[PDB]
Design a protein around this ligand. Sequence first.
Ligand SMILES: *c1ccc([N+](=O)[O-])cc1C(=O)Nc1ccncc1
Ligand SMILES: *c1ccc([N+](=O)[O-])cc1C(=O)Nc1ccncc1
Ligand SMILES: CCCCCCCCC(=O)O
Ligand SMILES: CCCCCCCCC(=O)O
Lengths: 258, 263
Amino acid sequence: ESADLRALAKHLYDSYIKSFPLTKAKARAILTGKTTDKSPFVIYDMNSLMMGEDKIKFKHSKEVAIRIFQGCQFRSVEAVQEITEYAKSIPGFVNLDLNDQVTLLKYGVHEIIYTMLASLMNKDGVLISEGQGFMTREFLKSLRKPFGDFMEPKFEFAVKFNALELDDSDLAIFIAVIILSGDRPGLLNVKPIEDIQDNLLQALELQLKLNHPESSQLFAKLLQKMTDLRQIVTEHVQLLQVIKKTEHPLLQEIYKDL
Amino acid sequence: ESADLRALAKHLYDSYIKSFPLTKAKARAILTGKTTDKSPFVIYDMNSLMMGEDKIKFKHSKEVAIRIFQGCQFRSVEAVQEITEYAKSIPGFVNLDLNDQVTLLKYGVHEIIYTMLASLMNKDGVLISEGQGFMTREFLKSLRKPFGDFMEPKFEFAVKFNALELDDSDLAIFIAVIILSGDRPGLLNVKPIEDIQDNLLQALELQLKLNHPESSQLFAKLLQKMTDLRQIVTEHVQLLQVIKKTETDMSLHPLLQEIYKDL
Ligand SMILES: *c1ccc([N+](=O)[O-])cc1C(=O)Nc1ccncc1
Ligand SMILES: *c1ccc([N+](=O)[O-])cc1C(=O)Nc1ccncc1
Ligand SMILES: CCCCCCCCC(=O)O
Ligand SMILES: CCCCCCCCC(=O)O
Protein backbone atom coordinates (compact mmCIF):
# COMPACT_ATOMS: atom_id res chain seq x y z
CA GLU A 1 0.00 0.00 0.00
CA SER A 2 1.55 3.25 -1.22
CA ALA A 3 0.22 5.07 1.86
CA ASP A 4 2.62 3.11 4.07
CA LEU A 5 5.47 3.69 1.62
CA ARG A 6 4.80 7.44 1.61
CA ALA A 7 4.39 7.28 5.39
CA LEU A 8 7.76 5.51 5.69
CA ALA A 9 9.31 8.07 3.32
CA LYS A 10 8.13 11.03 5.42
CA HIS A 11 9.30 9.36 8.62
CA LEU A 12 12.81 8.78 7.29
CA TYR A 13 13.03 12.30 5.86
CA ASP A 14 12.05 13.85 9.21
CA SER A 15 14.50 11.57 11.01
CA TYR A 16 17.24 12.47 8.51
CA ILE A 17 16.64 16.22 8.94
CA LYS A 18 16.93 15.79 12.72
CA SER A 19 20.05 13.63 12.47
CA PHE A 20 22.17 15.37 9.87
CA PRO A 21 22.76 19.07 10.55
CA LEU A 22 24.01 20.25 7.16
CA THR A 23 21.47 18.96 4.63
CA LYS A 24 21.91 18.89 0.87
CA ALA A 25 19.25 21.58 0.42
CA LYS A 26 21.29 23.76 2.80
CA ALA A 27 24.69 22.87 1.32
CA ARG A 28 23.41 23.47 -2.22
CA ALA A 29 22.50 27.04 -1.25
CA ILE A 30 25.94 27.78 0.25
CA LEU A 31 27.74 26.32 -2.79
CA THR A 32 25.83 28.17 -5.54
CA GLY A 33 26.07 31.55 -3.79
CA LYS A 34 22.27 31.72 -3.85
CA THR A 35 22.01 32.30 -0.09
CA THR A 36 24.44 35.24 0.10
CA ASP A 37 23.54 35.73 3.80
CA LYS A 38 26.90 34.16 4.72
CA SER A 39 29.81 33.12 2.51
CA PRO A 40 32.20 30.33 3.54
CA PHE A 41 35.86 31.04 3.93
CA VAL A 42 37.50 29.49 0.90
CA ILE A 43 40.72 27.52 1.41
CA TYR A 44 42.58 27.45 -1.89
CA ASP A 45 46.28 27.11 -0.91
CA MET A 46 48.66 27.04 2.08
CA ASN A 47 48.25 30.65 3.22
CA SER A 48 44.46 30.42 3.00
CA LEU A 49 44.70 27.25 5.10
CA MET A 50 46.87 28.87 7.78
CA MET A 51 44.34 31.71 7.77
CA GLY A 52 41.48 29.20 7.90
CA GLU A 53 42.19 27.94 11.42
CA ASP A 54 41.76 31.55 12.60
CA LYS A 55 38.28 32.05 11.13
CA ILE A 56 36.98 28.49 11.39
CA LYS A 57 37.98 27.01 14.75
CA PHE A 58 39.33 23.47 14.82
CA LYS A 59 41.16 21.60 17.59
CA HIS A 60 44.68 21.52 16.22
CA SER A 61 56.14 20.17 13.39
CA LYS A 62 52.88 18.50 12.34
CA GLU A 63 52.93 18.81 8.56
CA VAL A 64 50.01 20.40 6.71
CA ALA A 65 48.66 17.34 4.85
CA ILE A 66 48.79 15.27 8.05
CA ARG A 67 46.83 17.88 10.01
CA ILE A 68 44.24 18.00 7.22
CA PHE A 69 43.98 14.20 7.20
CA GLN A 70 43.64 14.15 11.00
CA GLY A 71 40.80 16.66 10.79
CA CYS A 72 39.17 14.44 8.18
CA GLN A 73 39.37 11.60 10.71
CA PHE A 74 37.86 13.82 13.42
CA ARG A 75 34.93 14.58 11.14
CA SER A 76 34.51 10.90 10.21
CA VAL A 77 34.05 10.04 13.88
CA GLU A 78 31.29 12.64 14.16
CA ALA A 79 29.49 11.39 11.04
CA VAL A 80 29.53 7.84 12.41
CA GLN A 81 27.54 9.02 15.45
CA GLU A 82 25.03 10.91 13.33
CA ILE A 83 24.63 7.85 11.10
CA THR A 84 24.18 5.59 14.13
CA GLU A 85 21.39 7.78 15.39
CA TYR A 86 19.72 7.93 11.98
CA ALA A 87 19.83 4.13 11.71
CA LYS A 88 18.06 3.74 15.07
CA SER A 89 15.09 5.54 13.52
CA ILE A 90 14.74 3.08 10.60
CA PRO A 91 11.64 0.98 11.42
CA GLY A 92 12.78 -2.47 12.48
CA PHE A 93 16.46 -1.65 12.93
CA VAL A 94 16.49 -1.53 16.75
CA ASN A 95 14.47 -4.77 16.86
CA LEU A 96 17.38 -6.60 15.20
CA ASP A 97 20.00 -8.72 16.93
CA LEU A 98 22.38 -6.28 18.62
CA ASN A 99 25.41 -7.81 16.89
CA ASP A 100 23.72 -7.44 13.51
CA GLN A 101 23.06 -3.77 14.27
CA VAL A 102 26.75 -3.26 15.04
CA THR A 103 27.85 -5.20 11.95
CA LEU A 104 25.46 -3.22 9.72
CA LEU A 105 26.76 0.12 10.98
CA LYS A 106 30.38 -1.04 10.88
CA TYR A 107 30.33 -1.93 7.17
CA GLY A 108 27.75 0.65 6.14
CA VAL A 109 29.29 3.93 7.32
CA HIS A 110 32.04 4.39 4.75
CA GLU A 111 29.42 3.95 2.06
CA ILE A 112 27.09 6.46 3.71
CA ILE A 113 29.92 8.90 4.42
CA TYR A 114 30.94 9.11 0.75
CA THR A 115 27.31 9.25 -0.34
CA MET A 116 26.69 12.21 1.93
CA LEU A 117 30.02 13.85 1.20
CA ALA A 118 28.71 14.24 -2.37
CA SER A 119 26.04 16.53 -0.95
CA LEU A 120 28.88 18.82 0.19
CA MET A 121 30.85 18.68 -3.07
CA ASN A 122 30.94 20.11 -6.55
CA LYS A 123 33.58 19.75 -9.23
CA ASP A 124 35.67 22.49 -7.56
CA GLY A 125 35.68 21.49 -3.89
CA VAL A 126 34.03 20.48 -0.63
CA LEU A 127 32.33 22.38 2.19
CA ILE A 128 33.94 21.67 5.56
CA SER A 129 33.01 22.37 9.21
CA GLU A 130 29.22 22.79 8.86
CA GLY A 131 29.90 24.73 5.68
CA GLN A 132 31.84 27.63 7.16
CA GLY A 133 34.64 26.44 4.90
CA PHE A 134 35.27 25.31 1.36
CA MET A 135 38.45 23.42 0.53
CA THR A 136 39.18 23.55 -3.17
CA ARG A 137 39.60 20.34 -5.10
CA GLU A 138 42.85 21.75 -6.49
CA PHE A 139 44.34 22.49 -3.08
CA LEU A 140 43.49 18.94 -1.89
CA LYS A 141 45.22 17.54 -4.98
CA SER A 142 48.36 19.65 -4.24
CA LEU A 143 49.12 17.60 -1.11
CA ARG A 144 52.06 15.19 -1.15
CA LYS A 145 51.71 11.49 -1.85
CA PRO A 146 49.73 9.62 -0.64
CA PHE A 147 47.64 12.51 0.70
CA GLY A 148 47.00 14.31 -2.59
CA ASP A 149 45.37 11.11 -3.87
CA PHE A 150 42.96 10.95 -0.95
CA MET A 151 39.88 12.96 -1.87
CA GLU A 152 40.14 12.92 -5.68
CA PRO A 153 38.27 9.58 -6.10
CA LYS A 154 35.50 10.96 -3.88
CA PHE A 155 35.25 14.14 -5.99
CA GLU A 156 35.22 11.85 -9.04
CA PHE A 157 32.30 9.86 -7.62
CA ALA A 158 30.38 12.92 -6.37
CA VAL A 159 30.40 14.70 -9.74
CA LYS A 160 28.67 11.66 -11.23
CA PHE A 161 26.49 10.99 -8.17
CA ASN A 162 25.31 14.60 -8.08
CA ALA A 163 24.32 14.44 -11.78
CA LEU A 164 21.42 12.31 -10.55
CA GLU A 165 20.13 15.46 -8.79
CA LEU A 166 18.76 13.57 -5.82
CA ASP A 167 17.37 15.63 -2.94
CA ASP A 168 17.31 15.03 0.83
CA SER A 169 13.99 13.19 0.73
CA ASP A 170 15.45 10.80 -1.88
CA LEU A 171 18.74 10.34 -0.05
CA ALA A 172 17.04 9.67 3.31
CA ILE A 173 15.58 6.46 1.87
CA PHE A 174 18.75 5.62 -0.10
CA ILE A 175 20.87 5.88 3.05
CA ALA A 176 18.47 3.51 4.82
CA VAL A 177 18.76 0.97 1.95
CA ILE A 178 22.55 1.05 2.33
CA ILE A 179 22.44 0.44 6.09
CA LEU A 180 20.13 -2.59 5.76
CA SER A 181 22.35 -4.67 3.41
CA GLY A 182 21.88 -8.37 4.22
CA ASP A 183 25.24 -9.21 2.63
CA ARG A 184 27.51 -7.68 5.27
CA PRO A 185 30.02 -10.23 6.60
CA GLY A 186 29.12 -11.98 9.84
CA LEU A 187 25.41 -11.26 10.03
CA LEU A 188 23.48 -13.74 12.16
CA ASN A 189 19.86 -13.25 11.07
CA VAL A 190 19.81 -11.90 7.50
CA LYS A 191 16.05 -12.40 7.05
CA PRO A 192 14.64 -9.38 8.97
CA ILE A 193 17.41 -7.25 7.49
CA GLU A 194 16.48 -8.11 3.89
CA ASP A 195 12.79 -7.85 4.80
CA ILE A 196 13.42 -4.26 5.87
CA GLN A 197 15.55 -3.45 2.85
CA ASP A 198 12.81 -4.70 0.51
CA ASN A 199 10.33 -2.43 2.29
CA LEU A 200 12.78 0.50 2.08
CA LEU A 201 13.46 -0.36 -1.58
CA GLN A 202 9.74 -0.17 -2.38
CA ALA A 203 9.57 3.16 -0.56
CA LEU A 204 12.57 4.46 -2.51
CA GLU A 205 11.07 3.39 -5.84
CA LEU A 206 7.74 5.14 -5.18
CA GLN A 207 9.65 8.23 -4.04
CA LEU A 208 11.87 8.52 -7.11
CA LYS A 209 8.79 8.03 -9.30
CA LEU A 210 6.78 10.91 -7.80
CA ASN A 211 9.72 13.19 -7.02
CA HIS A 212 11.34 12.70 -10.45
CA PRO A 213 8.65 11.60 -12.92
CA GLU A 214 10.82 12.70 -15.84
CA SER A 215 13.91 10.79 -14.63
CA SER A 216 13.55 7.48 -16.44
CA GLN A 217 14.85 4.43 -14.57
CA LEU A 218 16.44 6.62 -11.86
CA PHE A 219 15.78 3.84 -9.33
CA ALA A 220 18.02 1.44 -11.29
CA LYS A 221 20.70 4.07 -11.90
CA LEU A 222 20.78 4.83 -8.17
CA LEU A 223 21.12 1.13 -7.37
CA GLN A 224 24.00 0.94 -9.87
CA LYS A 225 25.80 3.75 -8.05
CA MET A 226 26.12 1.44 -5.04
CA THR A 227 28.70 -0.33 -7.21
CA ASP A 228 30.80 2.83 -7.48
CA LEU A 229 30.33 3.18 -3.71
CA ARG A 230 31.67 -0.25 -2.71
CA GLN A 231 34.58 0.15 -5.11
CA ILE A 232 35.29 3.58 -3.60
CA VAL A 233 35.34 2.09 -0.10
CA THR A 234 37.57 -0.83 -1.12
CA GLU A 235 40.06 1.60 -2.65
CA HIS A 236 39.73 3.80 0.43
CA VAL A 237 40.59 1.15 3.02
CA GLN A 238 43.76 0.09 1.22
CA LEU A 239 44.96 3.71 1.02
CA LEU A 240 44.48 3.93 4.80
CA GLN A 241 46.79 0.93 5.16
CA VAL A 242 49.47 2.60 3.02
CA ILE A 243 49.06 5.60 5.34
CA LYS A 244 49.44 3.36 8.42
CA LYS A 245 53.04 3.04 7.20
CA THR A 246 53.54 6.79 6.65
CA GLU A 247 52.65 8.11 10.11
CA HIS A 248 49.52 9.40 20.57
CA PRO A 249 48.02 6.35 22.34
CA LEU A 250 44.59 7.64 23.39
CA LEU A 251 44.19 9.33 19.98
CA GLN A 252 45.01 6.00 18.31
CA GLU A 253 42.13 4.47 20.28
CA ILE A 254 39.64 7.17 19.34
CA TYR A 255 40.58 6.73 15.67
CA LYS A 256 40.46 2.94 15.41
CA ASP A 257 39.67 1.94 11.82
CA LEU A 258 36.02 2.83 10.88
CA GLU B 1 10.58 16.02 29.36
CA SER B 2 11.03 12.55 30.89
CA ALA B 3 10.54 10.89 27.48
CA ASP B 4 13.69 12.61 26.21
CA LEU B 5 15.67 11.40 29.23
CA ARG B 6 14.29 7.85 28.93
CA ALA B 7 15.35 7.80 25.27
CA LEU B 8 18.87 8.87 26.27
CA ALA B 9 18.83 6.14 28.94
CA LYS B 10 17.95 3.50 26.34
CA HIS B 11 20.57 4.87 23.94
CA LEU B 12 23.36 4.55 26.50
CA TYR B 13 22.22 1.12 27.74
CA ASP B 14 22.18 -0.11 24.11
CA SER B 15 25.74 1.18 23.48
CA TYR B 16 26.92 -0.26 26.77
CA ILE B 17 25.79 -3.76 25.73
CA LYS B 18 27.61 -3.31 22.42
CA SER B 19 30.90 -2.08 23.93
CA PHE B 20 31.28 -4.25 27.07
CA PRO B 21 31.12 -7.99 26.35
CA LEU B 22 31.15 -9.04 30.05
CA THR B 23 28.15 -7.27 31.57
CA LYS B 24 27.14 -7.26 35.23
CA ALA B 25 24.08 -9.42 34.51
CA LYS B 26 26.33 -12.07 32.93
CA ALA B 27 28.92 -11.75 35.71
CA ARG B 28 26.27 -12.27 38.39
CA ALA B 29 24.84 -15.26 36.53
CA ILE B 30 28.30 -16.86 36.64
CA LEU B 31 28.98 -15.93 40.28
CA THR B 32 25.63 -17.02 41.74
CA GLY B 33 25.26 -20.37 39.95
CA LYS B 34 22.59 -19.79 37.24
CA THR B 35 22.18 -22.16 34.26
CA THR B 36 22.29 -19.42 31.60
CA ASP B 37 26.06 -19.43 32.20
CA LYS B 38 28.73 -21.95 33.01
CA SER B 39 31.08 -22.53 35.84
CA PRO B 40 34.38 -20.72 36.37
CA PHE B 41 37.59 -22.52 37.13
CA VAL B 42 38.84 -21.24 40.47
CA ILE B 43 42.41 -20.08 41.17
CA TYR B 44 43.36 -19.89 44.85
CA ASP B 45 47.01 -21.06 44.87
CA MET B 46 49.87 -21.83 42.50
CA ASN B 47 48.60 -25.35 41.70
CA SER B 48 45.18 -24.12 40.57
CA LEU B 49 46.99 -21.23 38.88
CA MET B 50 49.18 -23.72 36.96
CA MET B 51 46.06 -25.72 36.04
CA GLY B 52 44.42 -22.46 34.92
CA GLU B 53 46.42 -21.98 31.71
CA ASP B 54 45.46 -25.53 30.77
CA LYS B 55 41.74 -25.17 31.51
CA ILE B 56 41.21 -21.41 30.99
CA LYS B 57 42.39 -19.45 27.97
CA PHE B 58 45.24 -17.18 29.11
CA LYS B 59 47.98 -15.52 27.06
CA HIS B 60 51.00 -16.33 29.28
CA SER B 61 60.10 -18.15 35.18
CA LYS B 62 58.90 -14.52 35.32
CA GLU B 63 57.62 -15.14 38.88
CA VAL B 64 53.94 -15.67 39.75
CA ALA B 65 53.19 -12.16 41.05
CA ILE B 66 54.70 -10.47 37.98
CA ARG B 67 52.86 -12.85 35.63
CA ILE B 68 49.49 -12.02 37.22
CA PHE B 69 50.43 -8.34 37.03
CA GLN B 70 51.16 -8.40 33.29
CA GLY B 71 47.94 -10.32 32.70
CA CYS B 72 45.84 -7.90 34.71
CA GLN B 73 47.76 -5.16 32.94
CA PHE B 74 46.82 -6.42 29.45
CA ARG B 75 43.17 -6.71 30.52
CA SER B 76 43.30 -3.06 31.57
CA VAL B 77 44.44 -2.14 28.05
CA GLU B 78 41.43 -4.00 26.65
CA ALA B 79 39.10 -2.29 29.11
CA VAL B 80 40.49 1.11 28.07
CA GLN B 81 39.78 0.26 24.43
CA GLU B 82 36.23 -0.76 25.40
CA ILE B 83 35.62 2.41 27.44
CA THR B 84 36.98 4.56 24.62
CA GLU B 85 34.47 2.92 22.27
CA TYR B 86 31.56 3.49 24.66
CA ALA B 87 32.55 7.14 25.16
CA LYS B 88 32.25 7.96 21.43
CA SER B 89 28.65 6.82 21.69
CA ILE B 90 27.97 9.41 24.41
CA PRO B 91 26.08 12.13 22.53
CA GLY B 92 28.13 15.29 22.26
CA PHE B 93 31.41 13.62 23.24
CA VAL B 94 32.96 13.36 19.77
CA ASN B 95 31.82 16.92 18.97
CA LEU B 96 34.06 18.20 21.79
CA ASP B 97 37.55 19.56 21.29
CA LEU B 98 39.93 16.71 20.57
CA ASN B 99 42.21 17.78 23.41
CA ASP B 100 39.34 17.62 25.89
CA GLN B 101 38.28 14.19 24.55
CA VAL B 102 41.77 12.82 25.25
CA THR B 103 41.72 14.51 28.64
CA LEU B 104 38.29 13.22 29.61
CA LEU B 105 39.42 9.70 28.66
CA LYS B 106 42.81 9.97 30.37
CA TYR B 107 41.25 10.77 33.76
CA GLY B 108 37.89 9.02 33.48
CA VAL B 109 39.15 5.65 32.37
CA HIS B 110 40.52 4.25 35.60
CA GLU B 111 37.52 5.36 37.63
CA ILE B 112 35.45 3.41 35.10
CA ILE B 113 37.77 0.38 35.33
CA TYR B 114 37.09 -0.07 39.06
CA THR B 115 33.40 0.78 38.81
CA MET B 116 32.92 -1.99 36.30
CA LEU B 117 35.43 -4.33 37.91
CA ALA B 118 33.11 -4.19 40.91
CA SER B 119 30.63 -6.02 38.67
CA LEU B 120 33.08 -8.96 38.48
CA MET B 121 33.69 -9.12 42.24
CA ASN B 122 32.06 -10.50 45.32
CA LYS B 123 33.31 -10.96 48.90
CA ASP B 124 35.72 -13.69 47.93
CA GLY B 125 37.26 -12.85 44.56
CA VAL B 126 36.99 -11.64 40.99
CA LEU B 127 36.16 -13.13 37.62
CA ILE B 128 38.92 -13.20 35.01
CA SER B 129 39.36 -14.19 31.37
CA GLU B 130 35.87 -13.07 30.33
CA GLY B 131 34.32 -14.90 33.27
CA GLN B 132 36.02 -18.23 32.49
CA GLY B 133 38.13 -17.98 35.65
CA PHE B 134 37.76 -16.81 39.23
CA MET B 135 40.74 -15.58 41.22
CA THR B 136 40.14 -15.58 44.97
CA ARG B 137 40.75 -12.46 47.05
CA GLU B 138 43.00 -14.52 49.36
CA PHE B 139 45.34 -15.73 46.63
CA LEU B 140 45.69 -12.10 45.48
CA LYS B 141 46.37 -10.68 48.96
CA SER B 142 48.97 -13.42 49.52
CA LEU B 143 51.21 -12.25 46.69
CA ARG B 144 54.67 -10.93 47.43
CA LYS B 145 55.46 -7.66 49.17
CA PRO B 146 54.35 -5.01 46.69
CA PHE B 147 51.89 -6.98 44.54
CA GLY B 148 49.92 -8.49 47.42
CA ASP B 149 48.24 -5.13 48.02
CA PHE B 150 47.10 -4.10 44.54
CA MET B 151 43.60 -5.59 44.51
CA GLU B 152 42.45 -5.38 48.12
CA PRO B 153 41.34 -1.69 47.90
CA LYS B 154 39.36 -2.63 44.76
CA PHE B 155 37.64 -5.44 46.69
CA GLU B 156 36.87 -3.06 49.54
CA PHE B 157 35.27 -0.52 47.22
CA ALA B 158 33.44 -3.22 45.23
CA VAL B 159 31.81 -4.74 48.33
CA LYS B 160 30.32 -1.36 49.27
CA PHE B 161 29.55 -0.35 45.67
CA ASN B 162 27.83 -3.67 44.98
CA ALA B 163 25.59 -3.03 48.00
CA LEU B 164 23.84 -0.38 45.89
CA GLU B 165 22.58 -3.26 43.64
CA LEU B 166 22.94 -1.24 40.47
CA ASP B 167 22.21 -3.03 37.21
CA ASP B 168 23.85 -2.55 33.83
CA SER B 169 21.40 0.11 32.63
CA ASP B 170 22.13 2.15 35.76
CA LEU B 171 25.86 1.67 35.22
CA ALA B 172 25.68 2.81 31.60
CA ILE B 173 24.40 6.27 32.57
CA PHE B 174 26.66 6.44 35.63
CA ILE B 175 29.77 5.61 33.59
CA ALA B 176 28.79 8.39 31.16
CA VAL B 177 28.39 10.92 33.99
CA ILE B 178 31.92 9.97 35.06
CA ILE B 179 33.44 10.56 31.60
CA LEU B 180 31.82 13.98 31.15
CA SER B 181 33.29 15.50 34.30
CA GLY B 182 34.74 18.94 33.55
CA ASP B 183 36.79 19.22 36.74
CA ARG B 184 39.61 17.32 35.01
CA PRO B 185 42.99 19.07 35.08
CA GLY B 186 43.64 20.79 31.76
CA LEU B 187 40.23 20.98 30.10
CA LEU B 188 40.07 23.69 27.46
CA ASN B 189 36.29 24.35 27.37
CA VAL B 190 34.55 23.20 30.54
CA LYS B 191 31.07 24.49 29.65
CA PRO B 192 30.04 22.13 26.78
CA ILE B 193 31.25 19.24 28.95
CA GLU B 194 29.13 20.42 31.89
CA ASP B 195 26.05 20.87 29.68
CA ILE B 196 26.30 17.23 28.58
CA GLN B 197 26.91 15.94 32.10
CA ASP B 198 23.88 17.83 33.39
CA ASN B 199 21.77 16.00 30.83
CA LEU B 200 23.43 12.74 31.87
CA LEU B 201 22.78 13.60 35.55
CA GLN B 202 19.14 14.29 34.75
CA ALA B 203 19.08 10.98 32.89
CA LEU B 204 20.71 9.08 35.75
CA GLU B 205 18.37 10.63 38.30
CA LEU B 206 15.19 9.68 36.46
CA GLN B 207 16.65 6.22 35.80
CA LEU B 208 17.49 5.56 39.44
CA LYS B 209 14.02 6.55 40.63
CA LEU B 210 12.18 4.50 37.99
CA ASN B 211 14.46 1.47 38.31
CA HIS B 212 14.84 1.59 42.13
CA PRO B 213 11.79 3.45 43.49
CA GLU B 214 12.18 2.01 47.00
CA SER B 215 15.87 2.95 47.21
CA SER B 216 15.76 6.35 48.90
CA GLN B 217 18.45 8.83 47.81
CA LEU B 218 20.26 6.24 45.66
CA PHE B 219 21.16 9.06 43.25
CA ALA B 220 22.95 11.00 45.97
CA LYS B 221 24.45 7.81 47.40
CA LEU B 222 25.80 6.96 43.93
CA LEU B 223 27.47 10.36 43.42
CA GLN B 224 29.19 10.03 46.81
CA LYS B 225 30.85 6.82 45.57
CA MET B 226 32.81 8.97 43.11
CA THR B 227 34.98 9.85 46.12
CA ASP B 228 35.93 6.24 46.80
CA LEU B 229 36.77 6.05 43.10
CA ARG B 230 39.09 9.07 43.31
CA GLN B 231 40.90 7.53 46.28
CA ILE B 232 41.33 4.13 44.59
CA VAL B 233 43.15 5.74 41.63
CA THR B 234 45.63 7.66 43.80
CA GLU B 235 46.63 4.57 45.80
CA HIS B 236 47.05 2.73 42.49
CA VAL B 237 49.39 5.16 40.71
CA GLN B 238 51.54 5.42 43.82
CA LEU B 239 51.75 1.64 44.04
CA LEU B 240 52.64 1.65 40.33
CA GLN B 241 55.56 4.02 40.93
CA VAL B 242 56.95 1.55 43.49
CA ILE B 243 57.04 -1.30 40.95
CA LYS B 244 58.67 0.97 38.35
CA LYS B 245 61.65 1.31 40.73
CA THR B 246 61.56 -2.18 42.26
CA GLU B 247 61.55 -4.12 38.97
CA THR B 248 63.16 -1.90 36.38
CA ASP B 249 62.86 -4.90 33.98
CA MET B 250 59.04 -4.94 34.12
CA SER B 251 57.34 -3.11 31.25
CA LEU B 252 54.11 -1.11 31.14
CA HIS B 253 51.88 -0.96 28.06
CA PRO B 254 52.14 2.37 26.18
CA LEU B 255 48.39 3.13 26.21
CA LEU B 256 48.51 2.67 29.99
CA GLN B 257 51.73 4.66 30.40
CA GLU B 258 50.38 7.72 28.58
CA ILE B 259 47.22 7.59 30.72
CA TYR B 260 49.52 7.87 33.78
CA LYS B 261 51.03 11.36 34.01
CA ASP B 262 53.00 12.54 37.04
CA LEU B 263 51.20 15.45 38.73
C1 LIG C 1 38.94 11.42 6.23
C2 LIG C 1 40.05 10.74 6.73
C3 LIG C 1 39.95 9.40 7.06
C4 LIG C 1 38.74 8.72 6.89
N1 LIG C 1 38.64 7.30 7.25
O1 LIG C 1 39.82 6.57 7.57
O2 LIG C 1 37.39 6.66 7.33
C5 LIG C 1 37.63 9.39 6.38
C6 LIG C 1 37.72 10.74 6.04
C7 LIG C 1 36.50 11.54 5.51
O3 LIG C 1 36.32 11.80 4.36
N2 LIG C 1 35.58 12.00 6.57
C8 LIG C 1 34.38 12.83 6.33
C9 LIG C 1 33.11 12.45 6.79
C10 LIG C 1 32.02 13.27 6.56
N3 LIG C 1 32.18 14.41 5.92
C11 LIG C 1 33.37 14.81 5.48
C12 LIG C 1 34.50 14.04 5.68
C1 LIG D 1 46.24 -4.23 37.06
C2 LIG D 1 47.54 -3.68 37.02
C3 LIG D 1 47.78 -2.42 36.47
C4 LIG D 1 46.70 -1.69 35.96
N1 LIG D 1 46.86 -0.35 35.38
O1 LIG D 1 48.12 0.30 35.29
O2 LIG D 1 45.70 0.30 34.91
C5 LIG D 1 45.42 -2.22 36.00
C6 LIG D 1 45.17 -3.48 36.54
C7 LIG D 1 43.70 -4.00 36.52
O3 LIG D 1 43.10 -4.21 37.53
N2 LIG D 1 43.09 -4.22 35.19
C8 LIG D 1 41.70 -4.69 34.96
C9 LIG D 1 40.78 -3.88 34.28
C10 LIG D 1 39.47 -4.29 34.06
N3 LIG D 1 39.09 -5.47 34.50
C11 LIG D 1 39.94 -6.26 35.14
C12 LIG D 1 41.26 -5.91 35.39
C1 LIG E 1 39.93 20.13 7.97
C2 LIG E 1 38.48 19.65 7.83
C3 LIG E 1 38.38 18.27 7.19
C4 LIG E 1 36.94 17.80 6.98
C5 LIG E 1 36.85 16.62 6.00
C6 LIG E 1 36.16 17.00 4.69
C7 LIG E 1 36.93 16.57 3.44
C8 LIG E 1 38.21 17.38 3.18
C9 LIG E 1 39.46 16.78 3.84
O1 LIG E 1 40.04 15.75 3.36
O2 LIG E 1 39.91 17.33 4.88
C1 LIG F 1 45.39 -13.06 33.51
C2 LIG F 1 44.30 -12.00 33.37
C3 LIG F 1 44.07 -11.21 34.67
C4 LIG F 1 42.64 -10.69 34.72
C5 LIG F 1 42.56 -9.21 35.11
C6 LIG F 1 41.47 -8.92 36.14
C7 LIG F 1 41.98 -8.11 37.33
C8 LIG F 1 42.09 -8.97 38.58
C9 LIG F 1 43.26 -9.95 38.48
O1 LIG F 1 44.04 -9.91 37.49
O2 LIG F 1 43.43 -10.79 39.39
